[PDB]
Amino acid sequence: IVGGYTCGANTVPYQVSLNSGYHFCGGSLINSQWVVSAAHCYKSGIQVRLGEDNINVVEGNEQFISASKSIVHPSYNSNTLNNDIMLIKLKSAASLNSRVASISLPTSCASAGTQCLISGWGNTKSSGTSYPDVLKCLKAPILSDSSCKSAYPGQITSNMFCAGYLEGGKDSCQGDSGGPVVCSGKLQGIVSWGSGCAQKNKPGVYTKVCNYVSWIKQTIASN
Ligand SMILES: [Ca+2]
């Protein structure tokens, strides 16, 4: 996250870290056994880390649970990042408490202008490299589809939305991939892509979760 703030320990209790020997992506806990992330974050051998604030220090609230299965969206296109969504099932159920809690799926798509909370452990610079150890947060509005399509001509599908600041300076970034965009207390987006981070006229692009609710519900009911 570039230009954000320190969330504070366990104020984003649905945020997870995906670990393959190192943190590589975020995700969101949607119930005690399932996490949503980006398909572009797929790898074999994922450990899900819940209740994290400082990813480099054990502070005592964490739960580390291996993934049993990963399910990439059946229409994911790695070239265009269309349908950039994946489900991860945990080998055992998380213990839900005040520090580890699930986030609701949307029944409805969020509106342009809605302020959303984006979080993660990604890069904090638009130029250069500085990774934080503690969870960062950013509030950012959803942009109109026309401003989104203007920013990324020919690249925005109906399964994507833009959120951020056209002036630049504030954005998600590498390492935040997979993480939540929460608006009005529901998971509305997944950190997906953008051109650089925090660049002028290049806002963040997010998977539009409301288009996937039927697939998520069907998949969890059968796996
Ligand atoms: Ca920790």
Side-chain angles (χ1 to χ4, degrees):
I1 300 300
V2 178
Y5 60 98
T6 299
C7 306
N10 314 114
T11 63
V12 195
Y14 50 83
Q15 176 77 49
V16 316
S17 167
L18 307 183
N19 187 287
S20 67
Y22 48 90
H23 169 86
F24 71 88
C25 273
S28 304
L29 189 72
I30 57 161
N31 62 43
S32 66
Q33 285 233 92
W34 291 89
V35 164
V36 176
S37 184
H40 90 251
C41 294
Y42 175 76
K43 64 178 70 172
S44 58
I46 297 179
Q47 189 182 63
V48 173
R49 301 198 166 199
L50 305 98
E52 284 282 22
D53 190 41
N54 190 312
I55 49 170
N56 275 312
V57 179
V58 172
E59 55 230 306
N61 291 301
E62 299 92 339
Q63 298 175 45
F64 300 166
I65 305 169
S66 297
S68 62
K69 55 186 84 167
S70 294
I71 303 172
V72 168
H73 189 280
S75 299
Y76 170 59
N77 183 319
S78 60
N79 293 322
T80 62
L81 293 181
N82 197 26
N83 307 298
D84 189 15
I85 184 171
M86 154 180 88
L87 290 164
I88 301 168
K89 195 176 183 198
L90 303 179
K91 273 191 176 162
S92 61
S95 295
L96 299 187
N97 53 230
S98 69
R99 295 190 170 71
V100 170
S102 60
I103 185 75
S104 298
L105 293 176
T107 58
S108 160
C109 301
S111 296
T114 299
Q115 291 283 341
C116 302
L117 177 76
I118 309 172
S119 51
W121 293 275
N123 193 6
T124 63
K125 296 256 218 292
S126 53
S127 232
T129 300
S130 187
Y131 285 82
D133 59 357
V134 299
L135 189 65
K136 300 298 175 165
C137 278
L138 173 71
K139 291 179 170 192
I142 297 175
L143 299 174
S144 62
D145 288 331
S146 75
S147 50
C148 195
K149 287 168 161 158
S150 278
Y152 293 110
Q155 301 160 67
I156 303 298
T157 74
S158 57
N159 300 309
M160 298 174 186
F161 65 90
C162 291
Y165 296 91
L166 292 182
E167 59 272 32
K170 286 168 286 198
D171 196 6
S172 63
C173 201
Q174 208 273 8
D176 295 316
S177 287
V181 182
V182 169
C183 322
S184 318
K186 308 293 178 145
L187 184 69
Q188 291 284 2
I190 304 163
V191 176
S192 184
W193 65 273
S195 186
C197 307
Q199 301 269 224
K200 175 180 156 64
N201 302 126
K202 297 293 173 164
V205 185
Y206 301 94
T207 305
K208 193 166 179 170
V209 171
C210 66
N211 291 0
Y212 296 99
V213 168
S214 290
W215 168 75
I216 294 169
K217 285 179 178 295
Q218 293 185 247
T219 300
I220 290 173
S222 312
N223 289 270

